[PDB]
Amino acid sequence: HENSNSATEGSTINYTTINYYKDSYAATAGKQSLKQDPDKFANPVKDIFTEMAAPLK
Amino acid sequence: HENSNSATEGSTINYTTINYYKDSYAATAGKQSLKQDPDKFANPVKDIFTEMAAPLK
Amino acid sequence: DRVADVIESSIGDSVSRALTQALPAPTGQNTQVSSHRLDTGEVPALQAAEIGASSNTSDESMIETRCVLNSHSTAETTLDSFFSRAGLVGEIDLPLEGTTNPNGYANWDIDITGYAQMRRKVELFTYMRFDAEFTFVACTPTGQVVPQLLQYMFVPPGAPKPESRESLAWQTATNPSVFVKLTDPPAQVSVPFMSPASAYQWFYDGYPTFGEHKQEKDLEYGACPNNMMGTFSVRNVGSSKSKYPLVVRIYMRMKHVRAWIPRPMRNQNYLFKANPNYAGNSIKPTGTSRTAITTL
Amino acid sequence: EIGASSNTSDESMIETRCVLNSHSTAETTLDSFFSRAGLVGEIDLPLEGTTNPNGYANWDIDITGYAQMRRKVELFTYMRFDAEFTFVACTPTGQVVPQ
Amino acid sequence: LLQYMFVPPGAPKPESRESLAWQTATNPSVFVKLTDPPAQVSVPFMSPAS
Amino acid sequence: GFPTEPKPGTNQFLTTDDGVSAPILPNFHPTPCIHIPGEVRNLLELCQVETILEVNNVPTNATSLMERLRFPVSAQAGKGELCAVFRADPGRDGPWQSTMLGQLCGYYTQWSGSLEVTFMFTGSFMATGKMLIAYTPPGGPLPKDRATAMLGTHVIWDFGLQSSVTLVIPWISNTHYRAHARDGVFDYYTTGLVSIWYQTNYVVPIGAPNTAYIIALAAAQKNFTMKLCKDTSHILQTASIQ
Amino acid sequence: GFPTEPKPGTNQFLTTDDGVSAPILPNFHPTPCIHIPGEVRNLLELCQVETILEVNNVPTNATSLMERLRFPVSAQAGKGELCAVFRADPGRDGPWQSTMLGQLCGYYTQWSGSLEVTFMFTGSFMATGKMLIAYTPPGGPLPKDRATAMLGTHVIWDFGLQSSVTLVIPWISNTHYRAHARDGVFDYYTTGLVSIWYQTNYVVPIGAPNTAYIIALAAAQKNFTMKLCKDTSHILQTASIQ
Amino acid sequence: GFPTEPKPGTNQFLTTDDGVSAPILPNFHPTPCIHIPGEVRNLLELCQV
Amino acid sequence: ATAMLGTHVIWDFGLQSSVTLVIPWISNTHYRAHARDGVFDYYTTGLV
Amino acid sequence: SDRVAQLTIGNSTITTQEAANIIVGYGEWPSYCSDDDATAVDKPTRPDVSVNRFYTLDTKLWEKSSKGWYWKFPDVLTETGVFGQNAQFHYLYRSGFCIHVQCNASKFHQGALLVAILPEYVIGTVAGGTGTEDSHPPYKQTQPGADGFELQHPYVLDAGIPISQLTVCPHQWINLRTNNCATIIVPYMNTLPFDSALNHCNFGLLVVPISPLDFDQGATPVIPITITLAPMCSEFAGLRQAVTQ
Numbered sequence A, B: 001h002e003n004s005n006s007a008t009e010g011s012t013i014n015y016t017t018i019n020y021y022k023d024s025y026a027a028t029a030g031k032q033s034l035k036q037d038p039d040k041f042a043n044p045v046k047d048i049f050t051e052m053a054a055p056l057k
Numbered sequence C: 001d002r003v004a005d006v007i008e009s010s011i012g013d014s015v016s017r018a019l020t021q022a023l024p025a026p027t028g029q030n031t032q033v034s035s036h037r038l039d040t041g042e043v044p045a046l047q048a049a050e051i052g053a054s055s056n057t058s059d060e061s062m063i064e065t066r067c068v069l070n071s072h073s074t075a076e077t078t079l080d081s082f083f084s085r086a087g088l089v090g091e092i093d094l095p096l097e098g099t100t101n102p103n104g105y106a107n108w109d110i111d112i113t114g115y116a117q118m119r120r121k122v123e124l125f126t127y128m129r130f131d132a133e134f135t136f137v138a139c140t141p142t143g144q145v146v147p148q149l150l151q152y153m154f155v156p157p158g159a160p161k162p163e164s165r166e167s168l169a170w171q172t173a174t175n176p177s178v179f180v181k182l183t184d185p186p187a188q189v190s191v192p193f194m195s196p197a198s199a200y201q202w203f204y205d206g207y208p209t210f211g212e213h214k215q216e217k218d219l220e221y222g223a224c225p226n227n228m229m230g231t232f233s234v235r236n237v238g239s240s241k242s243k244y245p246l247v248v249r250i251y252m253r254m255k256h257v258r259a260w261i262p263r264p265m266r267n268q269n270y271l272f273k274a275n276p277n278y279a280g281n282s283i284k285p286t287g288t289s290r291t292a293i294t295t296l
Numbered sequence D: 001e002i003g004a005s006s007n008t009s010d011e012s013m014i015e016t017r018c019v020l021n022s023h024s025t026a027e028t029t030l031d032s033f034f035s036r037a038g039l040v041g042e043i044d045l046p047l048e049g050t051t052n053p054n055g056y057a058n059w060d061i062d063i064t065g066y067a068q069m070r071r072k073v074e075l076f077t078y079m080r081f082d083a084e085f086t087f088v089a090c091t092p093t094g095q096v097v098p099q
Numbered sequence E: 001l002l003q004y005m006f007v008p009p010g011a012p013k014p015e016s017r018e019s020l021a022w023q024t025a026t027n028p029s030v031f032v033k034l035t036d037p038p039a040q041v042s043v044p045f046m047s048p049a050s
Numbered sequence F, G: 001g002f003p004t005e006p007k008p009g010t011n012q013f014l015t016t017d018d019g020v021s022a023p024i025l026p027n028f029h030p031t032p033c034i035h036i037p038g039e040v041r042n043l044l045e046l047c048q049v050e051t052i053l054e055v056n057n058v059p060t061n062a063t064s065l066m067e068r069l070r071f072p073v074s075a076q077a078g079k080g081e082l083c084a085v086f087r088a089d090p091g092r093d094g095p096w097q098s099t100m101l102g103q104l105c106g107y108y109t110q111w112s113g114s115l116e117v118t119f120m121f122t123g124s125f126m127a128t129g130k131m132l133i134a135y136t137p138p139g140g141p142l143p144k145d146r147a148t149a150m151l152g153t154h155v156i157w158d159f160g161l162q163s164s165v166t167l168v169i170p171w172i173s174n175t176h177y178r179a180h181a182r183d184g185v186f187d188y189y190t191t192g193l194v195s196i197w198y199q200t201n202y203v204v205p206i207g208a209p210n211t212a213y214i215i216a217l218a219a220a221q222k223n224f225t226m227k228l229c230k231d232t233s234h235i236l237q238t239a240s241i242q
Numbered sequence H: 001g002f003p004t005e006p007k008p009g010t011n012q013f014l015t016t017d018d019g020v021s022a023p024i025l026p027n028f029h030p031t032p033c034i035h036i037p038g039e040v041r042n043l044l045e046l047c048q049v
Numbered sequence I: 001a002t003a004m005l006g007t008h009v010i011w012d013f014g015l016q017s018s019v020t021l022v023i024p025w026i027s028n029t030h031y032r033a034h035a036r037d038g039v040f041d042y043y044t045t046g047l048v
Numbered sequence J: 001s002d003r004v005a006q007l008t009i010g011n012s013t014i015t016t017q018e019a020a021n022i023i024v025g026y027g028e029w030p031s032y033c034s035d036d037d038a039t040a041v042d043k044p045t046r047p048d049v050s051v052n053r054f055y056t057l058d059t060k061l062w063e064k065s066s067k068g069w070y071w072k073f074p075d076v077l078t079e080t081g082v083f084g085q086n087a088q089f090h091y092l093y094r095s096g097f098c099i100h101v102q103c104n105a106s107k108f109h110q111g112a113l114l115v116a117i118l119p120e121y122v123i124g125t126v127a128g129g130t131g132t133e134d135s136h137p138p139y140k141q142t143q144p145g146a147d148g149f150e151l152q153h154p155y156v157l158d159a160g161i162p163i164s165q166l167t168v169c170p171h172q173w174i175n176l177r178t179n180n181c182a183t184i185i186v187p188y189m190n191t192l193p194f195d196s197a198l199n200h201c202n203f204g205l206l207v208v209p210i211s212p213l214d215f216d217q218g219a220t221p222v223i224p225i226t227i228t229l230a231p232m233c234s235e236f237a238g239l240r241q242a243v244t245q
């Protein structure tokens, strides 16, 4: 079959790549899934607040 | 079809290789089965004994 | 039977609370119709930066907006898109006459922090995991292609590093070596994510030894062994003078990239490898300057 | 004295936690360890000399001539395998010539 | 041996044969010998206009 | 052998070409990937994070560099006095260069989307005041007075518990994308101008500082995206790294 | 012919590249493979086999080389006297180099797993005694006395019918794998230290040797694995083999 | 490697040859194509004017 | 820096005029007889 | 119900009536190490309450000229309390932190502090001014422990990086007209499941005055800044004798 040894193993992202060797790290970079999570850096707040509200109550 | 003439013929291990010639010894090294048998060199004892026991009774 | 405080005791919870989720974002967010809003109690525009969160105010709340179906892709902004671009990371000289590397062989310590362009991009993040495609472009200093045979050899840390052009180490019985003519297209090869850590570390705030940490040893601050992948050795294959002065340029293209903890982009000129040192007397502003805040 | 290695487990010598070891053992197979090209022979075809003038040589096929490769194989008493022989030729300077 | 380098507007344009810009860390460059067949590459429809 | 016919492009090394290449380590298996906090997936994730906008990019004494991070606002006397001014263009030289957004733009040739600039007032609790922040779309020359600046997109900001207010610089462009704007000709891609005026006045009781500062934090909105990446110009070093 | 476009890496000879190549002998059929005892499948099989650990790697007289294979233990007088000491690091120079494990490590860049070291007492049946073997994890400097050494992982060994005792050097590391440890900087990957102390004392009746020896045999535990193989440094010959 | 045998025409650059070539910009996405009046499909369209 | 190692509370002045320090029952015995300098200091509660 | 708050760990309770919510670094609560994320096979110690509690480490005086300070973390808490002990006695350490920086003034004072967490905060030197000399920051500067260390070139965070962009890190501001404390909860961040509390500092805490402190004369001129912090989910393994460094 093929060795599962690329850096992105167990990665929550899904890639479709090409390869001609038994080791998967040799595969192309490939096209991949476009999921983002801004809140992680832009809104790491504990108790969220909406824009419509006044951030300080 | 193809000649069955590689060094690992009749080998209890299973390999998946690539080849473009009629002679199988020309095939790649390939990925293969990972079975081990430590006891053969580490415990070639006739009557086994557990770790929990005292080796000499 | 138990003591209760032991039964609740959430000590040993291996999974993290999260608080955020990754959603699909193939295109830019579209704009929806907005109308006038004259009301009390609702203030989008008003924020409290102190909290530490970016303003969540939407365009629709600040002006009457039309509707726009944004189909602009966000694909080119992925880590792979941004990083999977070959770039120069190493340069090796093999001159005939000189003090650099005569004898006909060199040992390049594998370290990508030697060139400013590539270095800055990666120093955008604190941790990075990835495979890479190394391409080696060789020729003479004039850029001329010559009928010469070379041998590149990856030498993992702990392996015998060649001491001469005819070192026994060139038998490369277990190390991976490459033999190429300068007349053949630049050699390219695929490298995995080798390293005992889960990711390469661009910045390691600490020491690696456990000693006294005196003056002389401050040389080891920020030195993280999980990044020293060993050396890359090259020699002209033979037992006599090369006959042609050579140069090898090492290009690296990252692939299957994962990156963590973004940091502020490099501000001052770089001075040394694996060492954020800056020129104290030449501390320049992040960017351009004007004459007054009230004039362009 | 018995001639067997200690079968004592870590768990019996200390209070251990639980660890799910997923480290591969693939790179330790014979093929992984041995399927690596290595130098086993070197042949000279000089112009002027006492070695091999005339323009030809006869190398007795024997891989025991170079230390790196030799030691690896001498790890075992018997070995069965196929092989890929690669021949790298050029002048002593490492120069490529139309020959 | 030559190096071709596409330099999108706004990118540092090389000032000399040894300009730092030739590190081409993000720009797309091509390295070819004049002995190799002419280099050929595929370019998309780049432009803010349609 | 099987009939082939090599074409132009043969043997070329294309930096951005994404193909395959022989693996150096057969059957090698990487170290497991632990779970680490703060994983990034797309750079856009970073562009929506506010960073300090050096509106006051005037000082250079190396002793006063920290002074650029914030501009002053103080009790005025007249009416509609101009506080500060700056270009909305993010990929252009200027204040935006201090921001992570501006920095990441250097890496892409074109961009698109609305921008936001939150201004946080850092004066005393006792100080009040109303300001008028105005975005002046392309073609409009730097407004000479407030009565002119107000004709564009704007917001009247009132100081209160809510320290800061955010000015949204909507994506108002003729083109779908914008290449970095830069004085000559490429000023075609200019975003516009931001001007801050005193709506009423900075008022304060006796016993409180007569002058305080405002801090600008800027980022991109959700409809923001970039394309065609190049290399940052901004920076390039000097003496090969030792 | 069919359109192709050769890429970088063309014509290169990659030692570790695993591809195919024309067979020199068409229709050749190998000699059947008889059944032979002791077939090896994985090197790890060999790493779990105990080999003599030259703890006493001091003597060099070529007449006394056999002396390294075992260290002495003799009737002491005091309390908690130190018997011997050594690094737990297996890929490092030192005692481990005498073992098959240490030798096979030279062939791989990194390793992982617990280690075991069985000590067999070879004195007279009449001699008794209790020893304390202690593994001192990274960061802990070579224990100055027993009272300090005991704070780490250890085992009190009592001499009896069961000649030997085994010290398990559990895999206690910050990283998942370890590259070979070696003085400068790479001491980061050090495993730790093993120290042997007298728990009570070597006791013997009249008519029995006042001094005897202990033999150390070491190997790797079941959770042991290695990766990224390189070439052994340890050895390299001199005058091309005749 | 897989057995091949290059034929005449190898390395030639044929102006009108319609083949493929490596893309310089990975994952690049063009500006949307607005609707514009007067699109031409065939030159014959112009010859009847 | 030493006092903080024990049970404590950081009090911030605000609309809520007061803060309450709870001196939890942390004793070896189930009950305590009145504490008093000599010997009976055994029953001391502690210090605030 | 957002400007008032109470933090309680172990036997410690922090109170506040002018807070500005709580930041949770990279949006993740501190957790213990997975059974498949770990390697060290010995069963760890999880002292719990004796270590996961608030330690009020130090006070700095904010002045109209202050440049700003920083504290490297894992380190800062060594030598102090039972936490410090488990850190010296054990090789491996792992833990998250709840950092509460406090500083108050009157409605008549003004100023703004940037409180951020910068992971792997490697320090640099001025390189001898000319930048030709390859100097290196001393053990006293890289790992100051409590007492922290004052910045000399905050604009570049003494590391050649723009502070203007420091906000891409879990941060929070202390704007006197608005609040009087910052609260940031940081999860364990490293490329390894455990590491040495001694030679490695997972991150640094930066407290920098971006908008200078100011006030008319006569108002109390002593505006202190106090750092209080609490380890969370502290785990230790690799027991030996106690090592200082």
Ligand SMILES: Cc1cc(CCCCCCCOc2ccc(C3=NCCO3)cc2)on1
Residues within 6 Å of the ligand: C110, C111, C112, C113, C132, C134, C152, C153, C154, C155, C176, C177, C178, C189, C191, C200, C201, C202, C227, C229, C232, C274, F024
């Ligand atoms: C065949 C063949 C292949 C090679 C070279 C293989 C190189 C693999 C390099 C992987 C590099 O990963 C790095 C991670 C971090 C750093 C780093 N430098 C300063 C601190 O971080 C450098 C390289 O040589 N011969």
Ligand SMILES: Cc1cc(CCCCCCCOc2ccc(C3=NCCO3)cc2)on1
Residues within 6 Å of the ligand: D061, D062, D063, D064, D083, D085, G024
């Ligand atoms: C075409 C073509 C192919 C060749 C060379 C084929 C060589 C096949 C060699 C197989 C070698 O197997 C060996 C086994 C044992 C020893 C050995 N040397 C010392 C005792 O054992 C050497 C080689 O030449 N031309």
